[PDB]
Coordinates of C-alpha atoms in Angstrom, one line a residue:
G1 CA 159.5 11.3 77.7
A2 CA 155.7 13.1 77.2
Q3 CA 153.8 10.7 74.4
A4 CA 154.9 12.3 70.5
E5 CA 154.1 11.8 67.5
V6 CA 156.6 10.2 64.7
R7 CA 157.9 12.9 61.8
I8 CA 160.1 13.7 59.8
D9 CA 162.5 16.1 60.6
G10 CA 164.7 17.8 58.1
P11 CA 165.5 16.9 54.5
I12 CA 164.9 13.7 53.4
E13 CA 168.3 12.6 51.6
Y14 CA 167.7 10.1 48.3
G15 CA 170.3 8.0 45.8
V16 CA 172.8 5.7 45.2
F17 CA 174.7 4.6 48.6
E18 CA 178.2 4.9 48.3
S19 CA 180.5 2.7 49.6
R20 CA 184.1 2.5 49.9
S34 CA 182.7 6.9 58.2
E35 CA 178.4 6.9 57.3
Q36 CA 177.9 6.8 53.7
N37 CA 177.5 8.9 51.0
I38 CA 174.4 9.3 49.2
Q39 CA 174.5 10.5 45.5
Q40 CA 171.5 12.1 44.9
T41 CA 169.7 10.9 42.2
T42 CA 166.2 9.2 40.9
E43 CA 168.7 6.9 38.1
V44 CA 169.9 4.1 39.5
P45 CA 172.2 1.7 37.4
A46 CA 171.0 -1.9 36.9
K47 CA 174.2 -3.2 38.1
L48 CA 175.2 -5.8 41.1
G49 CA 176.4 -4.0 44.1
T50 CA 174.1 -0.8 43.2
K51 CA 172.2 0.1 46.7
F52 CA 169.4 2.9 46.7
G53 CA 167.0 4.4 48.7
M54 CA 166.3 7.1 51.5
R55 CA 168.0 8.8 54.6
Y56 CA 166.2 10.1 56.8
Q57 CA 165.7 12.0 60.5
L58 CA 162.6 11.0 62.8
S59 CA 161.3 13.2 65.7
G60 CA 159.5 11.1 68.5
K61 CA 160.4 8.4 68.1
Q62 CA 159.5 5.9 71.4
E63 CA 159.7 2.4 72.5
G64 CA 155.7 1.7 72.4
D65 CA 155.6 3.2 69.4
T66 CA 154.0 1.9 66.2
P67 CA 156.9 0.0 63.8
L68 CA 157.6 1.3 60.6
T69 CA 156.9 -0.7 57.3
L70 CA 159.2 -0.4 54.5
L71 CA 157.2 -1.4 51.8
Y72 CA 159.1 -1.7 48.3
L73 CA 157.0 -1.8 44.8
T74 CA 159.3 -3.1 42.4
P75 CA 158.7 -3.9 38.7
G76 CA 158.7 -7.8 39.5
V77 CA 161.7 -9.9 41.0
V78 CA 161.4 -13.1 40.1
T79 CA 163.9 -15.5 43.0
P80 CA 165.0 -18.8 41.6
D81 CA 162.6 -20.9 43.0
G82 CA 159.8 -18.5 40.7
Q83 CA 157.8 -16.5 42.8
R84 CA 157.7 -13.3 41.7
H85 CA 158.2 -10.3 44.1
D86 CA 156.3 -7.0 43.3
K87 CA 156.3 -5.6 46.5
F88 CA 158.5 -6.3 49.8
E89 CA 157.4 -5.5 53.1
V90 CA 159.5 -4.9 55.7
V91 CA 158.6 -4.2 59.3
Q92 CA 161.2 -2.2 61.2
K93 CA 160.9 -1.2 65.0
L94 CA 161.6 2.2 66.0
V95 CA 165.0 2.9 67.9
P96 CA 164.9 6.1 70.1
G97 CA 168.2 7.1 69.9
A98 CA 169.4 6.1 66.2
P99 CA 170.3 9.5 64.9
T100 CA 169.2 8.7 61.2
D101 CA 166.7 6.2 59.4
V102 CA 167.2 4.2 56.4
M103 CA 165.4 2.2 53.6
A104 CA 167.8 0.8 50.9
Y105 CA 167.6 -1.6 48.7
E106 CA 170.9 -3.2 47.0
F107 CA 171.0 -5.5 43.9
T108 CA 172.9 -8.6 45.4
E109 CA 171.9 -11.2 43.4
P110 CA 171.3 -11.1 39.5
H111 CA 167.6 -11.6 39.9
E112 CA 167.3 -8.7 42.0
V113 CA 168.4 -6.9 39.1
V114 CA 164.9 -5.5 37.3
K115 CA 164.8 -2.7 35.4
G116 CA 161.8 0.0 35.7
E117 CA 160.6 1.8 38.3
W118 CA 161.0 1.3 41.9
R119 CA 159.1 2.7 44.5
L120 CA 160.1 3.1 48.1
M121 CA 157.7 3.7 50.7
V122 CA 158.0 4.1 54.6
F123 CA 154.8 4.0 56.3
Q124 CA 153.9 4.3 59.9
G125 CA 150.6 2.2 60.5
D126 CA 148.4 4.0 57.6
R127 CA 150.6 7.2 57.3
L128 CA 153.4 7.6 54.8
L129 CA 156.8 9.3 56.2
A130 CA 158.3 9.5 53.3
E131 CA 158.3 8.1 49.9
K132 CA 160.7 7.9 46.8
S133 CA 160.4 6.6 43.4
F134 CA 163.8 5.2 41.5
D135 CA 164.3 4.8 37.2
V136 CA 166.6 1.5 37.3
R137 CA 168.1 1.4 33.8

């Protein structure tokens, strides 16, 4: 339809994603330093259109060192906006041991230079 700005619509959910239906999120900034833990944000965006600038999901980490020896202090993920998706998610899961790094993880959703949502998690 008519051109529209992409905007946050309603509350940002944040915390630990529960798996066993959509995933419940236990609201917290305190995340266990345990394999299999998934955490982050779930949110709703109004104005999403096909020709829009995609999202940049910027994960700042305390320094994940992969087995190849490289340190990842940030990860950047580009996500094309899907107009008909009711929710959008920015999550991180500790799938491998080197990913379980204690400290502050700051997850930031941008569109271009504009920050849509952010949350800081304490992993311990």
